[PDB]
């Protein structure tokens, strides 16, 4: 298995870990803030996914400093992870095309 594919897999497992810890930590950070909605684990997990993918419907979001800091980590982990898959796909195509060109 080439590096890029290995890194892709690793990036994926790591994202899953960030999502779960992010969901757990968001609840921990947000409970105690009057008005917060990111306070139960099931929807927090959903919030973590739509944040990692940067969709951000706006149905749920953190209102506290630490909830927001946790959100930033999730955003960056998602962007980085998917960005890394793109780079792996590019490498795959670059390699295949170099062969097809007989180089």
């Amino acid at each position: 298995s080439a590096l890029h594919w290995r890194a892709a897999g690793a990036a994926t497992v790591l994202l899953v870990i960030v999502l779960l810890a992010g969901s757990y930590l968001a609840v921990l950070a947000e409970r105690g803030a009057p008005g917060a909605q990111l306070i139960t684990y099931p929807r927090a997990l959903w919030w973590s996914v739509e944040t990692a993918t940067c969709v951000g419907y706006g149905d749920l979001y953190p209102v506290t400093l630490w909830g927001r800091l946790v959100a930033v980590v999730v955003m960056v982990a998602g962007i980085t992870s998917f960005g890394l898959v793109t780079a792996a796909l590019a490498t795959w195509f670059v390699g295949r095309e170099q062969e097809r060109r007989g180089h």
Partner: antibody, heavy 118, light 106 residues
Framework: QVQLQQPGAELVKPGASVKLSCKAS????????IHWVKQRPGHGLEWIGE????????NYNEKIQKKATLTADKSSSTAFMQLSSLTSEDSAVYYC???????????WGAGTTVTVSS | DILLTQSPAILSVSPGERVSFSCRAS??????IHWYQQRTNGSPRLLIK???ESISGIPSRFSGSGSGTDFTLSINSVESEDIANYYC?????????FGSGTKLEI
């Protein structure tokens, strides 16, 4: 089997403090929160606060005067609530309840009747 | 903080009739409402979670409905054992809050 065990009663002198206990059994998850609810005779249910034993973080009802301090003991699976400097206004049944982090109180304790008197 | 209004405070019904308890939230809370039954000198007991989802061990005559700001707890054919106080509770926003409760008289 009873998931939450609470002592039946506690007599407290005005001004004094008491530490109520809530021993939990059954399934325990890192996502569990133990809540405390106050119910005065003839009145409804009033939320006091909550605590997540897996982390030790506690939040309290901001609308009422803070009389409690929540702690938890992971090894003995027990949650505690320290009520301090009580008055007759603190006389009531205090229930502990378990929430799986999904918003509802699936199980409640039998409740401890606290009487503040001389 | 979300105010939960339970009115009327007391509901009288004849044995066997269908009864409905009202719970109105001060703002929209989706379906994050839960219902509890508390009999004289007993501790609260979960009846319905998330507005309409049934709980195991609870008689089938118990059901809930509604979304947004208005919710209903219904009992199909009330019987003596249903005599108690009924409370709604919200978990949409922090902090969780409870309604004032409605008593069922037969």
């Amino acid at each position: 089997q009873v998931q939450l065990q609470q002592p039946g009663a506690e007599l407290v002198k005005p001004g004094a403090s008491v530490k109520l206990s809530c021993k939990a059994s059954g399934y325990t998850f890192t996502s569990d929160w133990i809540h405390w609810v106050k119910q005065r005779p003839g009145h409804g249910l009033e939320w006091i606060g909550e605590i997540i034993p897996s982390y030790g973080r506690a939040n309290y009802n901001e609308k009422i005067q803070k009389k409690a301090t929540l702690t938890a003991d992971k090894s003995s699976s027990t949650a505690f609530m320290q009520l301090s400097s009580l008055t007759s206004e603190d006389s009531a049944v205090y229930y502990c309840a378990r929430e799986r982090g999904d918003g509802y109180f699936a199980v409640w304790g039998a409740g401890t009747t606290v009487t503040v008197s001389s | 903080d979300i105010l939960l209004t339970q009115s009327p405070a007391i509901l009288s019904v004849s044995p066997g009739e269908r009864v409905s308890f009202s719970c109105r939230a001060s703002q929209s809370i989706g379906t994050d409402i839960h219902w509890y039954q508390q009999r004289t000198n007993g501790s609260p007991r979960l009846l319905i979670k998330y507005a309409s989802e049934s709980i195991s061990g609870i008689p089938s005559r118990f059901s809930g409905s509604g979304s947004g700001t208005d919710f209903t707890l219904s009992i199909n054919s009330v019987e003596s054992e249903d005599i108690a106080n009924y409370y709604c509770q919200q978990s949409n926003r922090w902090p969780f809050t409870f309604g004032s409760g409605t008593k069922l008289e037969i």
